[model samples]
Target: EVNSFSGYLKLTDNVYIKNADIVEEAKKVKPTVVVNAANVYLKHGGGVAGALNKATNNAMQVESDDYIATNGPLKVGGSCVLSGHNLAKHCLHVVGPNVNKGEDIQLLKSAYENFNQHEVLLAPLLSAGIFGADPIHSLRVCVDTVRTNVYLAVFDKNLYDKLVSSFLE
Candidate 1:
């Protein structure tokens, strides 16, 4: 329970992850094998089109970030998104109780399990710099392109043996 950053994860109030402990912390932060990559490129509207901004909106542009016309669900020290200099190297977790199982066109696999758990913590948040465009197999192709059964993207079984022993390969 020592997730640490000064006493077991504390930024106080909001994050309460428990989808099997964020897939067992994404298989203890996967990636202890595969090397060599630079041909994968995919980021089409991460989750409801980045919460409906149309990927940095247009019409002479005027982006803000309410995360889908909100009055709720938009936390992170309040007011921020691509502006305020985009300081969220953390805090963008949203869950409304996933109620699906696999197939049945589960909204692109529940937005690829919330974009592969935010790029598996954004590769240590861009190796500690915070962000430099965090990408994890491009959200693992939106959690393997919408699996279904009753709609589902449940990878949190302790990240299933560290994502099947590496690289859905």
Candidate 2:
């Protein structure tokens, strides 16, 4: 179905969507043991689909059999159970804004007041959203919030302290 010369491909643009609509995009998540992460998390050894393979399993050519696990807590690491469209590999899940988004003015005041405890390297939005949040904004908030705290999301970007300062300023 080659177009004569009128149609064009629509590039992936960040569009606003509801958080409730998030589950619709995520590729059904695998077990939480982490060994099944290969069925959810993306990989780079070769093909993209094989990403979900366990670090120690080798059903496909590109896979890691090591199995997924974090020496840290629950908030750190990756997964595919996220509720956003095209999660790009993995999503950093966590609690975020609720009904009425906790009252804008009040929320902002709280966020600012709690700024000191922000942990810059562990902000996590600290509480922000308004039906919680539309699909588009939800993703943005998630990314921004993570950047505020854990430095794993955008590790390829550069360093950690630098990101912390950016969040501070």
Candidate 3:
């Protein structure tokens, strides 16, 4: 299910919060671009990255591998754009900071800022999965940084509810 809240936090009508599979929704929404919370190595082995890879028949992984081979691993808070196959027209991968490193907030914000150039975007709650950042904090950074029409896909039910409540406040 998708829940939308606007005029809160002085946001416009372009942000959407959805408790759904991000890959599926991205395919359906067909936005101009989508964001992937990728590791510095750009490996789409698990989490949202893995799902996007699988959806694209592993094509995303091949492209990402090539990108790393040419330009080396991405730095934390850095981003790169890849050609999308079955998802959106473009896939933007951002290397979010691992919360355990203590540089969580700024790095996450930087990740978002790096990709905010798109006018329409689909993004998962970055760094809130295996990267171990809190979902609430990530959501706040997403809302604060992204200045485009965005869909925030959250797969966890409890986390979705918490984000919705927190966004209202």
Candidate 4:
């Protein structure tokens, strides 16, 4: 599939999050990598980060924090890649820009760019659902940015259809 967006981002939706185990779900998708919606400071666990932290047995956050402590303050959309450390094969911890502060555009585009090294990605809805980003805007940013196939592991059925519908349009 061609990933570049001449005008709009190409998209395909196959996965949903309701009643599913994300860790187990990712195992089946076999994406080249996974994307994590993380904070710039690498402090606190919420939404996707919280789940991944638990799934990876706390190694995800520990390593991410260490990387950020050394590297410190990635510009919005900037990322720190980590060994899956037993999650997937690898994971890219992309720090989201503050949506409330109006950095969402740069941050979302950059988040997708971080996965450019691979052709297939397994990801959650970056900052879309629980992270407080506008779902429509967040979904569009994801489609525009991903270079290849992105298997969105969505746990909320309410959001699953909403996301797929926007892409189908």
Candidate 5:
């Protein structure tokens, strides 16, 4: 099942904890943009980043299909927006918060605020996947800071269950 949570109208966010694949969920939502929590190193990547990279035929990470480079080597609290190829109108690459440096809400806020004009955006719960942070905490940062349609896609079964339960409580 795809569990959903609805909030404020203009900038509402949805957290989907479903059995469907990320690409399938993304296709269902059909967001105008999809944001990926990209590593600072940004290779031709994996997990959500790789899925989008694969979908886009590597447009987002191509440096001759073999080379890789960072868009400004963007740090936490920064973003790199690019074409989504066939997936969506655009993609936003947000460098995730540094878990070792202690919690910084501003860092999380920057990830959400970096791209504000899209009508609909799909993002994994920021800093939550391979980046390693709690999914619910990441969603809180996104929905609270961003002022547009946002969707959080969860692939990890544990995280998915936690997110769904959080909504219930």
Candidate 6:
């Protein structure tokens, strides 16, 4: 089971902040598109990417490889779409900048901005894991960029709580 908090942005757009595994949430929500915080190379090696690949029976990795073979590596702040297999209908793979780099914030924001086209999107906190971005800052970027209905799946309880509190005002 998962815990969730709901809110509205711009008094219209819906936002659901959930404390749950993103892979599980994606299975449940089955949004039109699920956002994958992928690397430039789109390798499903570890973190959310690894888990999602395993959930989809490694088919996502195969599709990602094919996409890269055709288009070359995805640029930072760029995105690509792939088959979601048994998961959502489409997987939107976005390459976020590593926090170690300059222009990390803009790139991260751009990553979120790319998500605008989807009607229903399930996204994890981008660049906040091994990429080392601040969770609150990433959350802010997400909230600021999202214009469509979104489910922000956060695994960390503390971050989830902080996200909830931020909107209390």
What is the lDDT, from 0 to 100, of the residue 122 in candidate 5? 69
TM-score of each: 0.23, 0.21, 0.88, 0.78, 0.73, 0.88
In model 5, how large is the Cα lDDT of residue 50? 82
Cα lDDT tens digits, model 5, 1-169, are: 1223232123233423343455655555556677777766565467777887786667767732232342346677777667666666667777778575564655777777775766566666777655656667876676567776566666666766666666667
Instruction: Please write out the lDDT profile of model 4 over residues 33-68, one tens digit for every residue.
Output: 767777777654666778778877788778877887
Give the per-residue lDDT digits (tens) of candidate 3, residues 53-122.
Answer: 9989989999989999999998899999998777878899988888866655678888888756887777
Q: How does each model score on lDDT? A: 0.24, 0.26, 0.80, 0.65, 0.62, 0.80
Error of 3 at 88 (Å): 1.0
**Per-residue lDDT of candidate 1, residues 1-169 (tens digit):** 2221111221113211122322223234332111111101112133321322232243101332233434333321121123211212232232211223221222323333432322222211110011122123323433344232111122244543343334345
Candidate 3 residue spans exceeding 4 A from truth: 1-12, 101-103
Worst 10 residues of 6 by lDDT: 2-11
Residues 10-52 of candidate 2: C-alpha lDDT, one tens digit per residue: 1112111111112212223211111111122233242222332
Worst 10 residues of 5 by lDDT: 1-10
| Reference-based lDDT, residue 45, model 4 | 68
Clashes of 4: 3
Model 1 spans with C-alpha error above 4 angstroms: 1-70, 73-90, 100-105, 108-110, 113-162, 166-169
Per-model tally of clashing residue pairs: 13, 21, 0, 3, 0, 0
User: Which of the two candidates, 1 or 6, achieves a greater lDDT against the reference?
Assistant: 6
